[PDB]
Amino acid sequence: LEFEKWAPSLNTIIYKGTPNQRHSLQHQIRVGNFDVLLTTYEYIIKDKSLLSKHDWAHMIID
DNA sequence: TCAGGATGTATATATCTGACACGTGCCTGGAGACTAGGGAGTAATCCCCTTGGCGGTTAAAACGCGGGGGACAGC
């Protein structure tokens, strides 16, 4: 909500729900096509083979 | 389903023995007294592992449901 509210032009990526949704998503960002990735603890663990693979410029943990 | 009969089983009576109960003498194995020392009890610490619950996902359990193959009764 706050990402949208406070900023436009940010390709905000989120993880949630089913693996089907997460799969179609990973396709979208399989090349790093995003400005910011928002996710959670369970997905950075469960999808670490994808998320640790992708390099990071900056990480914020709330 | 019922009475007769043949067989078999059971039951009282001797009777007979050899296997069990009992007496006796011996002797060694168990009890008593005593000593040492080390194993076990007991206290104090500590810290690792167990337990109780929750969060979150997802494979698996549950459930219905049709239908064909085996269980089973008969002969």
Structure token pair of residue A22:
């997460």
Helix segments in A7-62, DSSP class H: 19-28, 41-46, 48-51
Angle at A49 between CA A4 and CA A3, to 5 degrees: 5
Q: Is the CB of A16 under 7 A from strand B?
A: yes
Structure token pair of residue A20:
């089907």
Structure token pair of residue A4:
């949208």
Q: How was this structure determined?
A: cryo-EM
Nucleotide with C1' nearest the A40 CA:
B56
What's this structure's resolution in Å?
3.9
Q: Is the CB of A19 under 7 A from strand B?
A: yes
